[PDB]
RNA sequence: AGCUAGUUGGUGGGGUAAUGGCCCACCAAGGCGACGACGGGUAGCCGGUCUGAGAGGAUGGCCGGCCACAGGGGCACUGAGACACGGGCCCCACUCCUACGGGAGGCAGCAGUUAGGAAUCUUCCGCAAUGGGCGCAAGCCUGACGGAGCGACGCCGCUUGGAGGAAGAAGCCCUUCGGGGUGUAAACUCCUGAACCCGGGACGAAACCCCCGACGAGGGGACUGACGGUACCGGGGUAAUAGCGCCGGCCAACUCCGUGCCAGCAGCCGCGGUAAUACGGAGGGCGCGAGCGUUACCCGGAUUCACUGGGCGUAAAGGGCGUGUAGGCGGCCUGGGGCGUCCCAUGUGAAAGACCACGGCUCAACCGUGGGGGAGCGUGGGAUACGCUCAGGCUAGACGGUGGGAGAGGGUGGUGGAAUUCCCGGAGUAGCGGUGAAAUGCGCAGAUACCGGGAGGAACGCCGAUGGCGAAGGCAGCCACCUGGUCCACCCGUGACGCUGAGGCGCGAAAGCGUGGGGAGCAAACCGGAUUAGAUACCCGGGUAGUCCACGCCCUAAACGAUGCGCGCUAGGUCUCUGGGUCUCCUGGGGGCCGAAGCUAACGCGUUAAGCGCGCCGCCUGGGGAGUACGGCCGCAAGGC
RNA sequence: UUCCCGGGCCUUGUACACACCGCCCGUCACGCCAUGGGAGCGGGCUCUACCCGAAGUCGCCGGGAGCCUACGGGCAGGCGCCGAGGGUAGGGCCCGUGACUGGGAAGAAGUCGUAACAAGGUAGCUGUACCGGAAGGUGCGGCUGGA
RNA sequence: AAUGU
């Protein structure tokens, strides 16, 4: 556009949508779990996905992963949503921070456990 | 009705140079001289003649080239390889003397107009004066 | 959820189904489950085709290249 | 998208420290708005701060400055100052006392509780210092403030050790069973000595005051330390914490087993289906280190809203086309003003911050001192090239005059033939029509085919294209009338009168809509016959809107050159429509084809630009959802914007 | 050498490329996700009119009425305008919610055809109109991005 | 003269 066309009218300036709303865009939320699921994958992958329909404190009644090898989440336990989709199930946005209320570290687990609840074990 | 006098200048003689025309002519301006004058004084044209088409006034640029290349293509390298105006009547650029623009590291020029007359960035840088940036040329 | 759950079959029938397994490239499949008169949750077993080999399209260029590269 | 009645202004008042519609009478009809008023949403503003090559973008926490508030809300009193955070009156909500009639209160001071939340601290020590208030003073008060406390929340410093030490223990991991690796790593030998114990121990504090001198200047004397027996200094002195992320590519770092699209990973591409360097563990490696990772948010990358720095023939993107308002842009010569613009001088640009130089804590983080920048904006003087403005002149743009020209440009009134259908009349007999082949249908109630007459509607063969005209849509027998545009010549006249154009207005294929008319042929819908598995189709026989006219609507399209309009500049060739020429050839306007230079992702474009420039408008910022919904305007409706 | 099967070479169209045994469209059935409409209900904010109206300032009175005086006055008190708030009624913008309903996206070897891509087997697409289980077909006109 | 997990 001319110089006089973008005096008149101006650029428009980008504004970008929130990939995540977990509201106030605070870090993570709490909130309870109304179902706690299976899911079928996309089209080329197979398996039964671990998510719980969670209900935030701000108001939202989102669905969210349950990562690591085996769960303790009741149709009713009160979990920590943090943030992050599931390229692979749905409307799947956000993932839910094991080790933390109801929801239990992995037993067992000794790998990458910062990402995963469970703490030092001891090498008894 | 030709809008801009001075770009249309400029533009003739990139058009003109990039067909290794000997010379073109352009509509007589007294200004146009001067930026001509300065073209010359810097050996971007041979120079340049006041002369005349059925009465009407103009003004014949004598185009410059390099010698001629060997191998595929052998025009030669122009002396004016780049030759844009900057402030435009649709938005007209000025520039302080702390401003004023740095061609090609030095090895080009930036003719520009101030209260002082047409000077090139060197001769206005060397006197103090900014104004009107006209155009870069190298 | 994912167990090695255990059946129950007669001996002589867990035996035919053991000679046509091990022989052949015929699976067991889980046809359907329910409860039967007496309440019992009881598992329906098939007799499998198998076969249905599994298409894997392959070889990226990147990875050929990569490996040239390396290799030599 | 319009808003406004104390609204805009006026005279005179009331009020205040003071102007003022701040308030009030009275008079007038004013004020503001596409340069975005009114309304909605969000928000305390700046110094700075993060990011960034920069221009930009994002932000306003701490510290400094301003503003606003003090449970919600109104009000004044006092006073230099408040319409007053720990002052007052009143209503409201809420909690608390009561002898039930009326009392006490507001933590967004410090510290603390509870609620909310992912999450945010001690009911502390001291007025020693600095600052404040009061007082002659001593002094009192100061949850300002100087400190300690808790939290890896952040930055900087520090430690877990240093020199030796095997063809290389064990264990563990791999192995072409030789052996490779963890690994100088350890054990081991020396060595130093965080921590801890002991002893010494701050600067911060020299004043108010007292004395001499006049309580001035100056000189002398005296007290006072929360942090703290802490920092630090000296003696002695034990080797004394290591974790987290990653190892398919982007990305630095590979092997064994387990699982068998399961369990699971995941930022993107993607891994997982029985040898998984991608899942889980282990071995090993990489990065980093009292930290390492995740999540959210900002900038970056992203020239992915492009000013720097993008585009629109086919990728998203040219408005269907004109006329034109605001606005933006403007040829040649001269002179005045000197607004933009440029220059010099000067004021302002508070501190802190950032930069730089040197110093203080053992370094640093921090901190002190000094130095340099700083747009902007005010004032003063200067410059006049370009832009602006006023004036004088010019004719190269544009417009006009005379003279020719071509054309399916438009509107009205007529009228010419060929053809179809129907009716009338001759003649005439067994079929005609139709398809791929059939049938429905029409026909012995006399069709098809043939001659003549009549009625009526619609469209105009050849010419005729690769042509012409028009802004587009679009326009085709002929004649007459009314009427638009456009080209050339002579260079005669005016003298920049120009370019574009948000809104606006008008024009706008076909279909469609309303009245009234017309209706030959054609033909959605419809009905048959075929075909077919079916055939709500393609094929055949019928057939109504409609196609035609008048007036009024609708306003869309592959409204296409998928290419906005104007101007200037960049080889040529060949065909063609139209005009002028000293018509062997040159020249102007238009339409095609190929191709210099150049452009392009490529295809292709190329003097009819998609080249090189300038002015102005329109438009695009991934596919879908969607040209959908909501709103609004428009329309009879369909539906349009 | 038309036809059937297979195959050369060149050229052409293509939305194919594990390559026509390719690709691919719409309804219908089921399940899930977001959204429009929806008899209406439940709010938040704001606007207008009127009724009652605390405190308080200001404006009258300050007298058959008390109190101070230096009797000019002053205070108390009485009245009034304004007035927070409350009450009634009606509008506006926004948000939640609703039997039922419209279309949309995703889902996995569902059901019906086959419109498009190669004359996609009737060139395709397009504006509009009508029609039909569905893609779509047909009329009129347009485009070539077709012959 | 249709279709192809």
Redesign the pocket.
Known sequence: ??????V??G????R?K???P?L????????VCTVVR?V???????????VAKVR???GY?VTA?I?????NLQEHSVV????????????VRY?IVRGVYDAAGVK?????????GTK?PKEA | ?????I??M???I???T??Y?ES??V??????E?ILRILAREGFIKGYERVDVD???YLRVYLKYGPRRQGP?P?PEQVIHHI??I??????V??????IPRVRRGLGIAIL??????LTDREARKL?????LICEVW | ??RKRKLLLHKHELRRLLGKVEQKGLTLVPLKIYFNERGYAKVLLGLARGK?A?????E?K?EAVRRALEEL
């Open positions: 556009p001319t110089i006089n066309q973008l008149r009218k650029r428009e300036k980008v970008k929130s990939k995540v977990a106030k865009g605070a870090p993570f939320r709490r909130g299976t079928t994958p996309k089209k080329p992958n197979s398996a039964l996905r671990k935030l404190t701000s009644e992963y990562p690591g090898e085996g769960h920590l949503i943090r943030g992050g989709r599931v390229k692979d199930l749905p409307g993932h067992d687990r000794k790998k990458s456990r910062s990402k995963y030092k | 009705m030709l809008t801009d006098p770009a249309d400029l533009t003739r990139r058009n003109a990039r067909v025309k073109t002519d509509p007589a301006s007294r200004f146009k001067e009465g009407k006034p293509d025009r844009r105006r402030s435009k009547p649709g938005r007209r000025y520039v302080g003397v702390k401003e107009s101030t209260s002082k007359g047409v103090g004066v900014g104004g009107e | 959820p994912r249905k599994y298409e894997k399209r392959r990226d990147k």
